Design a protein around this ligand. Structure first.
Ligand SMILES: CC(=O)N[C@@H]1[C@@H](O[C@@H]2O[C@H](CO)[C@H](O)[C@H](O[C@]3(C(=O)O)C[C@H](O)[C@@H](NC(C)=O)[C@H]([C@H](O)[C@H](O)CO)O3)[C@H]2O)[C@H](O[C@@H]2O[C@@H](C)[C@@H](O)[C@@H](O)[C@@H]2O)[C@@H](CO)O[C@H]1O
Lengths: 217, 220
């Protein structure tokens, strides 16, 4: 019921100083210690700051926390690519007999230079065709920023509704994203056409890039 | 080195029960309060429960009060969470966490966390994946397609961990069929194709599935 509110997102260039707010009430931050947790993508949260400003061993001194009244703040000096993560503040709350409150969390991303993706296209395996469905995969590798358009063409006929996308989290070292788009057809439809093409629009490309293959070559 | 390993996750039907466990090593377990924290996939953190060193003081979040029971066995260095009357909104990674303080009685300070066990409350049936090669086209891209499984999660490695660079294992997507699907791809140098063996190792612990898939170039 009680909430510590943080900004949904935060961003910075490599070396920039990022600062994350944490707004509470007289019942939690105003009376009790504040803690900060860091969660790298696909991992469990780490203790980052405890009791307002203490740093554990193994936490670099570019992370620091402070507490002023009913609010708290985490500061990351010299943001690095390995700092891309979710950051949660937290504190005990005295109201309602007591309970622990986590903050709503802040995703931290690195702002780097625009980079066009590399596009690869994969035909369905023969093993999957033996089971009656075809999956065609388009890979957009190591691009920035995150927004990208994948458009499937089957003999130059634009597709709709038969594809799904998945995007990685920002890469730990070079701050890029990658994207996979999968076109799912029945085996019968797959053999009725020849050219399978995935067409990519992005801020790094002055004109759309197309990768394609001819079925059975 | 402190270590916490959760287990007991996987799929479970709504209304049913599930008991989670956590194995603790690398510290004097019987001196530290232990806790459970949970995280619904994609969402934020929620404290679940706490138990001090001798189980004298126990706490529960109101959202689980009456349904979950925390306990611990100091002789076995283990922490337990009995979950009854499970609901879809109980779907989450469940984290086992050790306190900073020794011999505390209240509050929580999560010093170290286990990697978590994913609990999926769902009416769907457990199903292991099918794994297909994404055979390669001086950068060449190859991968593995892990299709039509439930529930999450899958793990994928390449040559049993001997290959780490250039590997992208994409988040699973829920297909319209209710089953998951993901691709794991690695960019290698084309010089490597006739020379090197690439095997993707797919583990799906909820279905107790392990598959190794050699991914070779196409004949043409
Ligand atoms: C004793 C106990 O568990 N009391 C809890 C209370 O927790 C305590 O709160 C005080 C501050 O109000 C303090 O932070 C306690 O921490 C220390 C201490 O300085 O006494 C930290 C020491 O490292 C630790 N020593 C060792 C060797 O580990 C000691 C020690 O564990 C205890 O003194 C008992 O031997 O503890 C802290 O334990 C708790 O308070 C809340 O939670 C705290 C962690 C902190 O966030 C507070 O700001 C917060 O309000 C309350 C919750 O209502 O419950 C009491 O029973």
């Amino acid at each position: 019921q009680s909430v510590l509110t943080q900004p949904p997102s935060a961003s910075g260039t490599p070396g920039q100083r990022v600062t994350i707010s944490c707004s509470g009430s007289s019942s939690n931050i105003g009376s009790n210690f504040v803690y900060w947790y860091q969660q790298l993508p696909g991992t469990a949260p780490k203790l980052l700051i405890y009791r307002n400003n203490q740093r554990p061993s193994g936490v670099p001194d570019r992370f620091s926390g402070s507490r002023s009244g009913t609010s708290a703040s985490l500061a990351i000096s010299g943001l690095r690519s390995e700092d891309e993560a979710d950051y949660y503040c937290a504190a005990w709350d005295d109201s309602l007999g007591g309970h622990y409150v986590f903050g709503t969390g802040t995703k931290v991303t690195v702002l780097r230079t625009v980079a066009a993706p590399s596009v690869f296209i994969f035909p369905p395996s023969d093993e999957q065709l033996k089971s009656g469905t075809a999956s065609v995969v388009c890979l957009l590798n190591n691009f920035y920023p995150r927004e990208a358009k994948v458009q499937w063409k089957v003999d130059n006929a634009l597709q709709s509704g038969n594809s799904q996308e998945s995007v990685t989290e920002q890469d730990s070292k070079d701050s890029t994203y990658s994207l996979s788009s999968t076109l799912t057809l029945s085996k019968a439809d797959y053999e009725k056409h020849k050219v399978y093409a995935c067409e990519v629009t992005h801020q790094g490309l002055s004109s759309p890039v197309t990768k394609s293959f001819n079925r059975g070559e | 080195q402190v270590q916490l390993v959760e287990s007991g996750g996987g799929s479970v039907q709504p209304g049913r029960s599930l008991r989670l466990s956590c194995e603790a090593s690398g510290f004097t377990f019987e001196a530290y309060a232990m806790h459970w924290v949970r995280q619904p996939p994609g969402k934020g953190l929620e404290w679940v429960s706490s138990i001090n060193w001798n189980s004298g003081r126990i706490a529960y979040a109101d959202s689980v009060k009456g349904r979950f029971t925390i306990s611990r066995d100091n002789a076995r260095n283990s922490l337990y969470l009995q979950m009854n009357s499970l609901r879809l909104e109980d779907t989450a990674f469940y984290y086992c966490a050790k306190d900073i303080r020794r011999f505390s009685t209240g509050g929580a300070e999560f010093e170290y966390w286990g990697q978590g066990t994913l609990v999926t409350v769902s009416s769907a049936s457990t199903k292991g994946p099918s794994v297909f090669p994404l055979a390669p086209s001086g950068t060449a891209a190859l991968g593995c397609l892990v299709k039509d499984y439930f529930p999450e999660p899958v793990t994928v490695s390449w040559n049993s961990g001997a290959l780490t660079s250039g590997v992208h294992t994409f988040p699973a997507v829920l297909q319209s069929s209710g089953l998951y699907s993901l691709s794991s791809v690695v960019t290698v140098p084309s010089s490597s194709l006739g020379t090197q063996t690439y095997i993707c190792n797919v583990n799906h612990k909820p279905s107790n599935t392990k598959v190794d898939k050699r991914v070779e170039p196409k004949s043409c």
